Structure formats: C-alpha cells, structure tokens
Amino acid sequence: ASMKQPVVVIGSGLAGLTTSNRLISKYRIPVVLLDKAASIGGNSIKASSGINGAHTDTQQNLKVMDTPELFLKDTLHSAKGRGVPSLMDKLTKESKSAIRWLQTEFDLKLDLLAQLGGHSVPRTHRSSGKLPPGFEIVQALSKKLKDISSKDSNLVQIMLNSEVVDIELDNQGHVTGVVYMDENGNRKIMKSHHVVFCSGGFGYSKEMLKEYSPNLIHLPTTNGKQTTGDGQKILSKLGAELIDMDQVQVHPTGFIDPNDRENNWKFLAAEALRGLGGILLHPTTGRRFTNELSTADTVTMEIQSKCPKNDNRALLVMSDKVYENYTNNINFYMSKNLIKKVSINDLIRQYDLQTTASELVTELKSYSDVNTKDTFDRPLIINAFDKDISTESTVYVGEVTPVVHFTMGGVKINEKSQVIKKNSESVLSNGIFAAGEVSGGVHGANRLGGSSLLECVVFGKTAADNIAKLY
C-alpha cells in the first residue's frame, strides 16, 4: 500500500496488537495505536490459561483429535441459543490459522494443552517455559511493533495515555478522525479514514453493570480499572447496534487474598488449574460439591447455591502432579500468598473444616480412583492424588470466590468485523470495525475458557484484512 492517513487502532490488548501487526507487516498500512492506559496489554496481558485452537500442530504432536466441527459443537452448546452462529462458525474454523499465525510469525511455541470446562477435548494452548500465555503473546506482538517503529516511525506510532472519546464523521457518513484526550487532558484529533475499536469489555464499571445486569454490582472483579465499556457507549451514541449486553460472565474461581480479603479486585485462579487436575472443596464440610470442569456459568451457580450464602467461597485444591505441570504459575500464585502448600492435617485446622484428616484422605483416594464413578460426573480426571496419600501428605490450596470476569455482549459486528448499524444489516460506516471483547455475539450466554484470546486473533486479523481492501 502507498502511505496515506493512519489506521487508528483503539486498544493495545491482543485484538489491537493483532490488527496492528497484520496491517503493518502484510500490507505496509500505517497504524496509530491509541490506549488510554499507561501501559500496553489491557486484560489480555493477564491471561493465564491459554488460547483455543482446533486441529493444530500441537494437537497433532500430542495426538488429540479435534476438528472445527467439534469446536463449533462445544461453542454452540455453551452459548445456549444466543449469539450469532456465523460468528461461532468463523471463530472455530479460523482457529487453526490463528494458532499457526502466532507460531510462524512470532515463533510462539504454544506447545502445551489443557482441557477447560465445557470442552470435549484439550484445545487451550500455552507455551512451555516461564511466561504465561497472555504475557508471552502480548510481549511478542508489541515488541515487533517497537522494532518496526524503530526502523520507520511513520509506519507505526504507539500513543499511551490517550483516551478515545468519539469518532468524527463527515456529512455522510464516513470517518474523518478520532477524537481523543492526550496525557495532559487536552482534546486532540487524529485524522484518519479507518478505525478499529479493540477497547475491551465493561466488567469493571459498576454503573454499566447496574444497567445491564444489576444483580452483579456487589461482586468483585478480575478486570483492570480501564475496563469501563468506553467503546460500547461511543458506538451506541453514533448509531450502532448493541447485543447480548445482559450476558455477563461470572468466573467461579477468583482468588481471595488472605491479607486483603474484601478487595473489589482479585487475582484470577486460572481455569487451567482445574482442567490440569484441581478440585473444589466446600469451605465448611471439606468435601467436594460440584463438577469442577463444567462451564463457568454452571460452576458459579453451583458455588453460589451450595457454598455458604454468607462467606460464598471454596477451596481450590491441587496435587503434586498438578504442580509439576503448572509449576511457574503456581509459584507465582504462592508468591502473592494466594496458594499455600500444607499437609492435610494442617489443611483441616487452618481452614476450620468439619471433615477429619483421615476422612479427607478417604475422599481424595476415591476421587482419584478413575475406576470408580465420579460423584459429580467430572469428565476428565488427570494429575490426581497419590494412591497412598496420608494425613501427613502435602497439597496446594487457595481460597476462591466468584467474580465478574467477561462481558459476552457488545457492539454487533459481521464476519468482516464491521460494526452493524442499529436495526439494519448495513455497516454503520465503511471505515468502522471492532474486534475482541468490545464486540458482542461470538459467545452467547457463556464464553468457553480460551476463546477470547482466540477471538482477538481471528477478528483482529479479519479487520486488518478487510481494511486493506478499502485503504
């Protein structure tokens, strides 16, 4: 492409980083990357479990059989008759290419798997090594932009502390600029004909929860304070359709910090902790009470009903075998005092359980006996407890509680990632796209673990590819 006005990408999470890289590297289309925060990555950089992909090289290497058809099956079942099926088809059918794109263009290994709740096979990818997936992916894609900027600063500029407040359109009805407030609070205009909203969800905003799902306003959240639904409100005022805004995902296992128990913000206890073998104990009786590997809305519903109405939490318990397959993450969690290594005798007393140590041993040995039917029908039991566990054996334990986590609703988009005008099938504007958590319809009533990072790559690349046909 010959250089014209920049494409403005709003948000430096995975959606924005994907859009930016695809635009610069494949077509030489110049980018200005705005973010209202003081650092890159949003909630993407916090991602812990990984990114989904169906029929990958990694699944081939590990001899798991998976297809775009099966992924779509699990996705449709999780959505519960909400959402937009061609978006669910597109997400699962492009998942192979998304994984391969990260592998070949950035040398991200993504060589390990985990099976999360509501998945029929393991398909959530992470790389071996010391870096969790959200940080490793964001670091790689953002470093490439800085490398490119360093050789040609007019090809990409990253402008942090820049809050978009509106899009200016001409008499009818095309993009001419993006209005933003700079670091000093001064109103600025970036002239452009193309904008991609990659600005994230709205889970942090109590004001918007009160409007779209008021029952959740007292819950704590995993979301960064920047997660305030800005893009959703801007595009709605400009005439865009919003969909599924009342579908808010409450994640069942946010960590309780024992020295900060009532912080509205929680570290997340990754769903990979359960898929890789973790179980949940009731915090008074000390017994298992639910299928830990169901979808997030179901686990949350089980905790909120079966655990105490006041003090609504649970103990996430993980074996040594879990630890050996998730070592660096659990070491991190322990560094924040969120997970403790404790003998079973001491487990009973520090958590004031009703079960005896010998009784808990008997339960754990039964749980780990794959030849006995699981009480709660758990579909995958791996990395369980040693057949000769005793009351002096050690386990890893944290306290967890449900948290507002992800907003399935957002602005209506199509398969080209273009924003849909209210009450229409026509795009709101030739030059307005959206990608990632800011958009609605991809997940319906519940998002499967691992699918939002995936959504960012799939629809970030798509917006970039379709802008190139219009630049």
Ligand SMILES: Cc1cc2nc3c(=O)[nH]c(=O)nc-3n(C[C@H](O)[C@H](O)[C@H](O)COP(=O)(O)OP(=O)(O)OC[C@H]3O[C@@H](n4cnc5c(N)ncnc54)[C@H](O)[C@@H]3O)c2cc1C
């Ligand atoms: C702790 C945590 C762990 C997670 N782990 C996983 C996982 O393992 N697998 C998975 O699939 N999903 C995971 N998720 C969900 C997923 O990471 C997020 O949905 C993902 O970050 C969405 O990417 P995004 O690019 O749309 O938004 P974000 O990553 O949130 O980026 C949005 C950016 O837009 C910026 N912004 C907001 N408003 C403006 C504005 N007006 N102007 C300019 N910039 C603005 C924000 O500051 C932010 O940086 C996790 C989420 C959290 C909170």
